[PDB]
């Protein structure tokens, strides 16, 4: 996996030394090319994980997330063009350095072969995200945003540190393959449930579940437009990879211990959907819908079902794409209006004919309608949860009952109706935006046509 | 401001049979029920004591609500109708011409030239109308919603761009 | 029922300012000038046979346009759905499963040639 | 569908509101102020206000019922509301 990591690491001096205005161009081009190299990794041999070295390995679970991150890096890269055109050249290169280091640490996490290295790079993501959120933020509460995000993630992570060093001392190794192959039944001992809690709560923290979901709403709102999509897109899914890999040792104790959090997700995905009918900010709207989708993926994980795993694996990719998709639109409207109020500007279709079209398929993908991979990822979870506990379909039906009520509500109160008469600075949509949502939505259906790749590693 | 007795009874008369025509549909039935003597309103014009006027208002306004249709007549362009806000889809604010481009600017050339000197008139009129509105504005925040006129020659009325450049009711 | 010199002045002045504005909204003869584009010489010949516009020429261009709609939309689709079907679809099994036609007592079969015996004695319930 | 030209609604107002036979046509005019020029208050206006609006295919604002009194006011409001500009 040096093939894709080394280009990213060595790309850094290019941005840090190139000319004051070619840095955007060169970073964009080389990001598209290392993403090109990345999609060659979609190959997965039989059931064997694609091994590369003693420290780096990948599989069908990893590959979609890897090529995801490589595909995004250009997206916030050229989304940053508007918001960073007026700041100093050295700060521009530093911002690009932050993004590149973030992507590097992501592809390091996802290819990790041994647990504690995955953990080191798992916490290595906060530093770039914290820097991006705090420095290049816009409003005042961004400082408390960084505090909440950093402290929440750490307070989750440290128990996982103690648990992992304990696993290494006891079992003998933390390599993924061996602990899957040398797995043993985690008994119902009173130390074992705290073992499980330490190995689970860390990932649950950066997978906002009901109750412990304040950092995302209070950080994504005023995070920089480029950063916000990165938080909402990937770092909620590295935790999902964490569950995907750590649940191989947490059985069979997961059978009955998962129940408190399990239901805390289903009712949770209703409340964060129920909260989602009433938001004064569009960014908070997308954040709460995202929280609902991650509660869905959480209950997908905790059942331990191959169909649940497939629905999850599809759901991380689908939700990340759609969430960043909507966040781009929120950025565009805010930047034109220099505010983030919900009902400030309705009826934008009367001014930007193609922008509300983008809004339309963005919400439609948020709807999870067939045959989009959002629907198929949800549907596998529907089937798994039904086979789990019969009635679960009632609560999850309430979720596929609220999702569109808020998604299309956002359309009717942003794009449909008529423009508010006071605002008059809304110019024609620049090709940068509509181009970026084009590169966002078209591959969303392209890989929908080929769902095997993102379907899951249990295929 | 305050809706007076005259205005209250006028609105009641307007709403009474708009309504009752929908009750009767046929215009012969209309004319009959309207001529269910119209002097029924005028049979008791002598109400020098306004207390009895208010009591007969308690009868008049609070007899209409149940002699009126649960599904009364509405016009298309009327609110709650069929074409009240139907054509708002095609209407666009006037400022949406400055964003146009030299291809489209020269591809309807003289229209944008006429808009150019129309906004030039706006330029020459803005300061005159603001200085005219400030001088004659009574203290405490005008006195009504009446907007002052253009008292001079060649000048412009205050605050005249929006109500003129508003989109036509048939923008198509 | 209180129309002061103020707002009658305001109202009819707004009226004929907007009237003048609309008189300037009248696009000049040159407007709405469009640019030159590319016109197809075959369609040029077809159009030049409609300037006279005899009924037979109108019908002829009508059936030619219906003919190009048919060739592009009727047998062009069957050019490739058949190729996909009888050479690629039917190349993989159990793709086009057809309901067996209702085999009938007293019908022979094309290949074997055997006939299943006709139905036995009816009740002969005459009307 | 007509543009409802100024002459169109102009003919409308010389048929409607010149429909009024309570006042003889000799004293009738397009500037006719019914309260004292004709001697009948705005009262004996509102009813036909409801009639004429049923014909043109429009609704006079209930707030604009008062002061809407002469044929010149009728063409005024119809022209401004129906963008009668031709």
């Amino acid at each position: 996996m040096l093939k894709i990591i080394i280009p990213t690491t060595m790309l850094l001096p290019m941005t840090w030394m190139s000319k004051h205005n070619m840095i955007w161009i060169n970073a964009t081009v080389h990001s598209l090319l290392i993403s090109l190299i990345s999609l060659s990794l979609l190959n997965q041999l039989g059931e064997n994980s694609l091994n590369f070295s003693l420290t780096f390995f990948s599989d069908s679970l990893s590959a979609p997330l890897l090529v995801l991150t490589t595909w995004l890096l250009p997206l916030m890269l050229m989304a940053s063009q508007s918001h960073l055109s007026k700041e100093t050249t050295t700060r521009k290169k530093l911002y690009i350095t932050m993004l590149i280091l973030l992507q590097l640490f992501l592809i390091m996490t996802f290819t990790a072969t041994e647990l504690i290295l995955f953990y080191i790079l798992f916490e290595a993501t906060l530093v770039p995200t914290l820097i991006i959120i705090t420095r290049w933020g816009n409003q005042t509460e961004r400082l408390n945003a960084g505090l909440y995000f950093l402290f929440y993630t750490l307070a989750g992570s440290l128990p996982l540190l103690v648990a992992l060093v304990y696993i290494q001392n006891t079992t003998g190794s933390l390599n993924f393959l061996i602990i899957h192959y040398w797995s043993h039944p985690l008994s119902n001992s009173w130390s074992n449930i705290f073992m499980w809690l330490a190995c689970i709560m860390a990932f649950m923290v950066k997978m906002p579940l009901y109750g412990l979901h304040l950092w995302l709403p209070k950080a994504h709102v005023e995070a920089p437009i480029a950063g916000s999509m990165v938080l909402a897109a990937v770092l909620l899914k590295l935790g999902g990879y964490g569950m995907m890999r750590i649940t191989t040792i947490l059985n069979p104790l997961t059978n009955y211990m998962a129940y408190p959090f399990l239901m805390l997700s289903m009712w949770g995905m209703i409340m964060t959907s129920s909260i989602c009918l009433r938001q004064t900010d569009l960014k908070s709207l997308i954040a709460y819908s995202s929280v609902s989708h991650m509660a869905l993926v959480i209950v997908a994980i905790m059942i331990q079902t191959p169909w649940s795993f497939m629905g999850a694996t599809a759901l991380m990719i689908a939700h990340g794409l759609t969430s960043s998709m909507l966040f781009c639109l929120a950025n565009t409207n805010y930047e034109r209006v220099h505010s983030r109020t919900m009902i400030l500007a309705r009826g934008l279709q009367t001014l930007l004919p193609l922008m509300a079209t983008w809004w339309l398929m963005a919400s439609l993908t948020n709807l999870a309608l067939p045959p989009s991979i959002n629907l198929i990822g949800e549907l596998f979870i529907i089937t798994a949860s039904f086979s789990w506990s019969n009635i679960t379909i009632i609560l999850m039906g309430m979720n596929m009952m609220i999702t569109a009520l808020y998604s299309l509500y956002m359309l009717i109160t942003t794009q449909r109706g008529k423009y508010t008469h006071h605002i008059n600075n809304i110019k024609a949509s620049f090709t940068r935006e509509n181009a970026l949502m084009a590169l966002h939505i078209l591959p969303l259906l392209l890989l929908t046509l080929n769902p095997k790749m993102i379907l899951g590693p249990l295929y | 401001a305050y809706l007076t007795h005259q205005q209250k009874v006028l609105r009641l008369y307007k709403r009474a049979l708009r309504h009752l025509e929908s009750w009767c549909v046929h215009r012969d039935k209309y004319r009959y029920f309207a001529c269910l003597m119209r002097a029924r309103f005028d049979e008791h014009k002598n109400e020098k004591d306004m207390v009895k006027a208010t009591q007969l208002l308690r009868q008049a306004e609070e007899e209409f609500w149940y002699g009126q249709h649960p599904q009364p007549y509405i016009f298309p362009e009327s609110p709650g109708g069929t074409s009240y806000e139907r054509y708002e889809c095609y209407k666009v604010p006037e400022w949406c011409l400055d964003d146009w481009h030299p291809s489209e600017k020269a591809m309807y050339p003289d229209y944008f030239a006429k808009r150019e000197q129309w906004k030039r008139l706006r330029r020459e009129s803005w300061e005159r109308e603001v200085k005219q509105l400030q001088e004659e504005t009574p203290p405490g925040g005008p006195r009504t919603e009446a907007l002052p006129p253009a008292r001079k020659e060649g000048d412009l009325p205050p605050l005249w761009w929006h109500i003129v450049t508003r989109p036509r009711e048939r923008p198509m | 029922s209180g129309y002061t010199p103020d707002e009658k002045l305001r109202l009819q002045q707004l009226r004929e300012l907007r009237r003048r504005w609309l008189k300037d909204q009248e696009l000049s003869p040159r407007e709405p000038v469009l640019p030159p584009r590319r016109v197809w010489p075959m369609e040029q010949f077809w159009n030049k046979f409609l300037q006279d516009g005899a009924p037979w020429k109108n019908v002829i261009y009508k059936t030619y346009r219906h003919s190009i709609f048919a060739v592009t939309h009727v047998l062009i689709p069957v050019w490739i759905i058949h190729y996909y079907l009888k050479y690629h679809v039917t190349a993989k099994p159990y793709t086009v499963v057809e309901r067996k036609p209702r085999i009938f007592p007293g019908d022979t079969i094309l290949e074997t040639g055997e006939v299943i015996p006709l139905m036995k004695e009816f009740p002969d319930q005459h009307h | 569908a007509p543009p409802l030209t100024l002459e169109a609604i102009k003919d409308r107002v010389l048929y409607v509101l010149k429909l009024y036979d309570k006042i003889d046509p000799e004293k009738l005019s397009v500037n006719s102020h019914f309260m004292k020029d004709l001697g009948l208050d705005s009262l004996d206006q509102v009813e036909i206000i409801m009639a004429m609006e049923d014909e043109f295919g429009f609704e006079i604002p209930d707030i604009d019922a008062e002061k809407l009194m002469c044929p010149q006011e009728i063409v005024d409001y119809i022209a401004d509301k129906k963008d009668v500009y031709e």
């Binding site: 004919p353 024609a428 | 666009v92 964003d99 146009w100 989109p167 | 909204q25 | -």
Partner: peptide
């Protein structure tokens, strides 16, 4: 009688 149809036209 023809007029100007107004729309947020942009050749972008």
């Amino acid at each position: 009688k023809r007029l100007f149809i107004i729309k947020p036209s942009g050749f972008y």
